[PDB]
Amino acid sequence: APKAPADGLKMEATKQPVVFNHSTHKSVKCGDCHHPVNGKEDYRKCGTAGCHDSMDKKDKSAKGYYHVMHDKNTKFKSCVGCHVEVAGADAAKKKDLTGCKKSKCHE
Ligand code: HEM
Ligand code: HEM
Ligand code: HEM
Ligand code: HEM
C-alpha cells in the first residue's frame, strides 16, 4: 500500500506555487485524484511526461496542466471544481477555497 506523503507538498511547475496537504483531504478517496489510468489508480506526479505536461494554459484538452487544476466539466474533479462543490454559496468558504487571490491556494 502506497502511503500518503506528509503535508507541505509544494506544487511548483508554474509561477504560482501551491501547497498540498494530504491531511486536510482525508475525506476524499485517493482515487478522486490519483485516478485510474489503464484500469489502475496512477500515483505519479500529475505533470509527468505523457500525463498533464501541456504547459500552455490556453489549452483545454485532457493534457493541460492548468486545465486539470482549475476547469469544471472534466471527467475527474479539478482542485477548483471539487472546491466549488464543497463551498456552495457560503461567502467565507468561496473565498478560502475558490478565490484567485487571498485564498488558501494563492496569495
Ligand atoms: C479562477 C480561479 C484561479 C485563478 C485565475 C488562478 C490562476 C492560476 C494561474 C494563473 C496559475 C499559474 C499557471 C501558469 O502560469 O502556467 C495557477 C496555478 C495553480 N493553481 Fe490557480 N488560480 C485560481 C484558483 C485556484 C485555487 C482556489 C486553487 C486550489 C484549489 C488553485 C490551484 C492551482 C494549482 C494547483 C496550480 C499549479 C501549481 C504549480 O505547479 O505551480 N488555483 N493558478
Ligand atoms: C492515502 C491516500 C492517498 C494516497 C495513498 C496518496 C499518495 C500520494 C503519493 C505516494 C504521492 C507522491 C507521488 C510522487 O510525487 O511520486 C502523492 C502526491 C500528491 N497527492 Fe496523493 N495520496 C492520496 C490521496 C490524495 C488525495 C485525496 C488528493 C487530493 C484531494 C491527492 C493529491 C495529490 C497531489 C496533487 C499530489 C502531488 C502530485 C504532484 O506533485 O504532481 N492525494 N500522494
Ligand atoms: C494527482 C494527480 C493527477 C491529477 C490532479 C489529474 C487530473 C485529471 C483530471 C481533472 C482529468 C480529467 C481531464 C478532462 O476531463 O479534461 C484527468 C484525466 C486524465 N489524466 Fe490525470 N491527473 C493526475 C495524474 C495522472 C497521471 C500521472 C497520468 C498518466 C499516467 C494521468 C493521465 C490522464 C489521462 C489519460 C486522462 C484521461 C482519463 C480518462 O479519459 O479516463 N493523470 N486527470
Ligand atoms: C491539487 C489538488 C487541490 C488543491 C491544490 C487543494 C488545495 C486545498 C487547500 C489549500 C485546502 C485548505 C486546507 C489546507 O490548506 O490544506 C483544501 C481543502 C479541502 N479540499 Fe482541496 N485541493 C485540491 C483538490 C481538491 C479536490 C479534488 C477535492 C475533492 C475531490 C478537494 C476537497 C477539499 C476539502 C473537502 C477540503 C476541506 C475544506 C474545509 O476544511 O474548509 N480538494 N484543499
Side-chain angles (χ1 to χ4, degrees):
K3 261 239 292 157
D7 285 336
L9 303 154
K10 204 205 306 201
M11 309 180 67
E12 58 185 331
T14 80
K15 70 143 28 199
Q16 314 260 58
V18 172
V19 175
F20 190 83
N21 291 321
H22 279 84
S23 56
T24 58
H25 289 86
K26 253 132 85 320
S27 81
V28 184
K29 265 19 245 337
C30 320
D32 278 321
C33 309
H34 297 297
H35 65 84
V37 178
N38 278 312
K40 153 180 177 202
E41 298 171 338
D42 209 295
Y43 296 78
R44 56 204 133 142
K45 286 178 145 74
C46 314
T48 284
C51 307
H52 314 291
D53 55 24
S54 196
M55 298 291 162
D56 183 31
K57 70 144 166 8
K58 59 91 130 19
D59 174 17
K60 291 201 184 304
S61 109
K63 275 224 155 216
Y65 183 83
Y66 181 95
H67 167 70
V68 314
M69 311 294 177
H70 308 84
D71 287 358
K72 260 286 193 224
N73 58 247
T74 50
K75 183 173 167 166
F76 297 114
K77 291 201 197 145
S78 73
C79 301
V80 179
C82 166
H83 282 192
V84 161
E85 290 173 7
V86 158
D90 175 319
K93 280 254 201 189
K94 272 157 95 200
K95 212 266 230 141
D96 283 305
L97 304 166
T98 80
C100 305
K101 302 201 286 357
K102 267 195 85 226
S103 67
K104 271 164 196 179
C105 296
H106 294 306
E107 219 191 304

